[PDB]
RNA sequence: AUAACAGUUUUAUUAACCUCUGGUUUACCUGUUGUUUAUGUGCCUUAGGGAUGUUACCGUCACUUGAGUAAAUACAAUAGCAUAAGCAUGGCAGGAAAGCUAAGUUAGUCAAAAAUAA
RNA sequence: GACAUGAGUAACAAAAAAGAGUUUAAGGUACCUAAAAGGUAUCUUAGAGUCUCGCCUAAAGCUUAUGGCUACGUCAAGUAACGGCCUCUAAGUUUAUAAUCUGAAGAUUAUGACGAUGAGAAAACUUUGGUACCAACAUUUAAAAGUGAAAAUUGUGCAGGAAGGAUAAACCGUACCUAGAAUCUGAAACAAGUAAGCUAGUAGAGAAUACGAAGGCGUGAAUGAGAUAACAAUCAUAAAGGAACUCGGCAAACUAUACCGUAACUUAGGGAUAAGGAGAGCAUGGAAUAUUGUUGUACGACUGUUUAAUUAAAACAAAGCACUUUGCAAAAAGACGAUAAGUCUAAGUAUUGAGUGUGAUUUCAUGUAACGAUACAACAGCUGUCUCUAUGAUUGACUCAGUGAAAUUGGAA
RNA sequence: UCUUACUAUAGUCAGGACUAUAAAGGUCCGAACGGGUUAUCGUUGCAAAGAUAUCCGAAGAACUAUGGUAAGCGAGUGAA
């Protein structure tokens, strides 16, 4: 009867919902990635992109508001205004990437996702795009336009850029990571 | 607020290497204290005889240790020396059929009780740092952090092997402000003589090495009268 | 209930429009070629790449 | 009164909290015994 | 309805009321024993 | 917004100090500034009106905010009124206070001829 | 004939709508009480001494404090202070846009015809 | 007895609460690899732990009882730091003996035995009756100070406060569980119930209220993830009005320190905290204290008791008062005894006991002070009771995954 | 072993206020504890008598623990 919801309530109390979002944003910085449900990964994505925006401000108020979101500031603030601030210095927003994944809990079959920091040590799209390039080179195939489009996304703002991407490809081929990969030319002849 | 230490090599004041982590030995971390550079420290403000001897009692089944200045422990010692290590793991009282004298330390100076009151302090400060701040056993040795909270509380109670290693350390000058050191400062220093009485000869082998100022004797005064015979290795 | 529901009127309620829908939004995975849901990450390559970034780095 | 009357504040053995204050034996490596 | 009439019950009052010695030692208790004994009861009391 | 059981102030020299509204005359909506009502005298001031006399009154002041056609919104600190007879002729002869400006458009020249102040 | 200015109903009901007037505001800003946690900082004196704090002992039937007796120390210190958060109805208090809303605004009834009754 | 229907529906909602990593064992899959193996990843089952968040906290913590369909390596001469067994006895029990009464069964009295919820030498080594007593209350006392016990000292009030004995180490208990997270009682894994000690600190008069150190927990998938309609429950706020609601102010809201001054009435104690004057920014700020107030009637003096689990009251009781009865010489009257001996009355004696009605006092049924979760009326305030509802919050309702009822049903297009 | 009365042996009642007392009161406010006034929910309930709030007593005719006695032709106990 009243207004629509401004955001997801996630079937929690007010205080319980503010702590759930501060914990996902704390694990995101500490671990560079988290595997949770999709509605949780989409609600923390807005709070993690606003916390990295405070890390790009030179005022003290931003340094005090960053302390009021994390749960171990003494141990995580140096990383926020250090490595992370330098990483996202030149990026105009969009510092997080939420990727849908198969259920993390098979009991409830609740749709899950992966919230990660772009251009990070655990960027799952930078590695999945490196595995595609690794297979293509190792099977004499031609990369698709979507692979070329993802290859530039994961190397435009990254510090090393292409050099760090070619090293990942080299490490995935010397390990034989693409062994047993179904060639893209035999996908139309497969049923199972 | 508490501050836990890390299992990192450090320098020792003792003459021996108490633990493999010890880097150096007999290092002066602070100028000698008032009573350290004193040939005859005295029983200034304590009863006659106090400090001449120190006893150690242990739970023969679980391994919990208690240090006492008198020949008998009371309900105070069990409360002020045994921290909470889990439900059903802190006894509610002292059961005479379980607690036995582990060892007894007697100093050469028959009236310098101030040296024993210092040895007693380092033993009680080392035991608190064994039940708490056990970072050297979290991932090595007993691996207390790889155990359940139930099994972790049982190993934290088994302070008998640790207590015998605190004796070889304290009686070798470990600690800062230990009065077992004797500095002449004419500047040569040495350790005061001591004697440890053991109810079990095999119990003195928990310390990897004992100092050269401690003499080991079997049998504690008053234990034979109780029809308790000492355990000898040679037999 | 006034009467017992017959085999006909109970079979209408149970199966008329309640047939399980076949999932048709399936695509292959670029890195390995295994079947996955559309717009979703491969579950066998996620774990393998997720574990490959934990050993060496 | 400036003293803290809760002597063992934030002090636990199961969780390896560490000593509340700095002792005279806190700068030395814990003596490791020979196991049973 | 039924009440929790056995809350706080002790097993000392169970032996004093329905025990074996409360029955062999009384004229009316010897009948209960013989009846339960003639029926085949294993639990003659308590 | 004046309803039944509402207590208002009498700002005319009629001898009434505190009246209670008993009926909104001619309408179902609650009386606002310039509306006719029937009140019951509850107090007096030390042919006056005795306590308990039922008379008609006009609302001149309302604590409820009133929006004019130009977007001006007026609010007073209390509800007041002036006692009138069923004819529409002020029982009193002089008003002591400020009345709302909505009496001008509702043809209350008689109340406005007693030189009341306006807001 | 122009130009400028001024004046041109009420009640009820139905629906829509938030420009206005208010109400609400549970992840907004500000102020603030009690208490806890983390981080930083933190007394005097000439690295030493002292104040506060710490550990052990002494002592009591037992517990706490003080003296006394030893030692360490802001290096991992006391009280205090700074920042931040938690809990106490969203802790409370003052405001508050959007959305929803009436008591608010606007509109129909309040344009019109045919065939009929007495 | 089996199998249907409701129905794959209700339910798994104590207003604590979860989040992201890590790891062990056994087993299922996919790839690697085709020498089996091993390796990488993943899932199932059964566990464990780390970091963060929150909840209880004079507990939902610890130590122990009653108890136990939880599990069997739980270890003592005694004290410090232990109970039972054992000795002694109370209320009582007695198919013990003696006497006595008695249709049988049995009952009475005395003695004996038995019977804890009580009393029991020593130990940090040990084996008469106030010259009183160990009920309640109060006071004092292990000498640096404070606090809590223990025991004793002194005292106070009346309601006048046990019994008896003394004074070289056997046998039995010892595990776990204490009810918010797997154990007791409630038919059960039940939002109920159950005994004792301890139960950080801050702040307080306090065991109030608030926070919470340690600890425990945030259930055995007996669930989890979404979404945030109607409606329901539990709440928050609210323009103007302020009981217009309603059988009825039901519910909700208001009500707010060692201070100056206090009435009628009164059993002279009270009424009485009467009333009336007052304690940097919007606020000296949260929680609790904290509740409508005042006045006047009816009934009952008062505090109490009552239909466990629909009636808490005007009913019962009550102190006070009145009346009848009881002289104790063998049985005082009264009550009890298939029915007696005999027991209570009572180790009492007409100011004793029993029975009956009344229900303090005042006036002799009636009028006041005081008191009431009694009934009723008025007055003031207060508020969503209402004009007239709106919005916000949580939990259900709704959808997905897991588990899976019931009343009901002659047969049904 | 519920419950009513009695009985023996024991325990418990934070703090404050008033009153003639240090202690003499079926005194006062209010926790523990004991009650169950009003409303709401619940009614195949968490519960075959519960939850929430509110309310009453809380040094007494009080409450609680472990035993004991008294019940079914007659009626045990009963502030009824
Ligand atoms: K007979
Ligand atoms: K009271
Ligand atoms: Mg839910
Ligand atoms: Mg809150
Ligand atoms: Mg035990
Ligand atoms: Mg019954
Ligand atoms: Mg009972
Ligand atoms: Mg007009
Ligand atoms: Mg609007
Ligand atoms: Mg707008
Ligand atoms: Mg904020
Ligand atoms: Mg907290
Ligand atoms: Mg709390
Ligand atoms: Mg506000
Ligand atoms: Mg608005
Ligand atoms: Mg028109
Ligand atoms: Mg016509
Ligand atoms: Mg249905
Ligand atoms: Mg339904
Ligand atoms: Mg459901
Ligand atoms: Mg496997
Ligand atoms: Mg409390
Ligand atoms: Mg059971
Ligand atoms: Mg024994
Ligand atoms: Mg006997
Ligand atoms: Mg006993
Ligand atoms: Mg329960
Ligand atoms: Mg409970
Ligand atoms: Mg049960
Ligand atoms: Mg527990
Ligand atoms: Mg959980
Ligand atoms: Mg209002
Ligand atoms: Mg208002
Ligand atoms: Mg009406
Ligand atoms: Mg009315
Ligand atoms: Mg009410
Ligand atoms: Mg009465
Ligand atoms: Mg009843
Ligand atoms: Mg009732
Ligand atoms: Mg009379
Ligand atoms: Mg007679
Ligand atoms: Mg009468
Ligand atoms: Mg009468
Ligand atoms: Mg009463
Ligand atoms: Mg389902
Ligand atoms: Mg009973
Ligand atoms: Mg009283
Ligand atoms: Mg009272
Ligand atoms: Mg009752
Ligand atoms: Mg219902
Ligand atoms: Zn793949």
Author numbering:
A (entry chain L): 2 to 193
B (entry chain d): 33 to 218, 243 to 291
C (entry chain W): 66 to 122
D (entry chain T): 53 to 88
E (entry chain Y): 95 to 140
F (entry chain I): 1 to 46, 59 to 131
Task: Paste lines from the article.
Protein synthesis in mitochondria supports bioenergetics of eukaryotic cells and is executed by dedicated mitoribosomes. To provide a representative reference for studying protein synthesis in the mitochondria of fungi, and to reveal how the mitoribosome functions in coordination with its translation partners, we determined structures of the translating mitoribosome from the representative fungal model organism Neurospora crassa. The fungal mito-ribosome consists of 78 different proteins, 23S and 16S rRNAs. Forty-eight bacterial orthologs are extended, and 30 proteins are mitochondria-specific.
